[PDB]
A and B are shown apart, each in its own frame.
With several copies, the nearest count.
Chain A
Amino acid sequence: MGIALGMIETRGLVPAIEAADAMTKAAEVRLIGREFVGGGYVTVLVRGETGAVNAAVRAGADACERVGDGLVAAHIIARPHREVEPALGN
């Protein structure tokens, strides 16, 4: 039911899955996607309520700073436009 996006950029899939597992061990969110951007760039996209998303991304950032090539970015869009849902794949 959550609409807020919590999502992580990582160079390397190791910090990507570590971030995703931090997402699911931090707060009640479901990952809507795992995307291979290219050149080691990988994102994890999770949906949920604003507080749960914020806590999850907090844990993911605190976990992925040093793993592999390292964390690239964390961002917490909380209310995407109705047209942005197709951009995340639905």
Chain B
Amino acid sequence: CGSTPKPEARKVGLSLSSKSNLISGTMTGRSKIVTGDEPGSCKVLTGTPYAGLDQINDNCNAEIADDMKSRATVNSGNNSNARLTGLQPGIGGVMTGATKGSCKNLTGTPYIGGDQFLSNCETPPNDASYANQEKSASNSWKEFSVNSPSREK
């Protein structure tokens, strides 16, 4: 016949996770044809991910995209939580013994802070080294009314 038709009924939905994992099988984000889900398309969503970064890429600009890329862990951002100031059960340091092999990633439910990691292993954590909490107490000084408590005080 010399007339090639084009394919259709593409049921599998290739979306992209909050940290760029190729998720597949349908998708419930923003389609170029559907209506009614337009509101809130480019809004931050802290917590359990439900909308794809493909949706952000094809409906929102880049800053929303990389803000979502930075955001949206699940439960374990691992050892980024360095200081707890709670007497620090900790991993060795001043005391020997269990200090042995205290550099490998626990890659799961975290137990030790990254500050103890540094004070035991000279390297920063092999898991998230930028250490979200870390600063904890150290930052202090001019925190006072940090973020925005209406600055009434």
Contact = CB atoms under 8 A, between A and B. Distances in A.
Chain B interface SS verdict (over half):
loop
Interface string B106-149: 11111111000000000000000000110011001001001111
Contact of B50 (A39, A51, A66, A69): A51
Interface in A35-71: 39-41, 50-51, 54-55, 57-63, 65-71
A61 B50 contact: no
Contact of A58 (B13, B35, B149, B152): B13
Question: What band does the interface of chain A fall in when counting residues whose beta carbon is under 8 Å from B?
Answer: 35 or more
B107 A74 contact: yes
Nearest to B79: A58
A76 B35 contact: yes
Interface residues of B, number: 84
A64 to B, nearest CB: 8
Contacts of B112: 58
Contact of A76 (B17, B19, B109): B109
A25 B100 CA distance: 14
Nearest to A55: B89
A69 B48 CA distance: 18
Contacts of B140: 69-70
Contact of A75 (B89, B107, B113): B107
A55 B81 contact: no
B80 A62 contact: yes
Interface of A: 6, 11, 14, 18, 22, 25-27, 39-41, 50-51, 54-55, 57-63, 65-78
The 5 closest A-B pairs by CB, nearest first: A62-B101, A58-B40, A76-B86, A76-B25, A76-B36
5 contacts: A25-B75, A39-B152, A65-B43, A65-B133, A72-B148
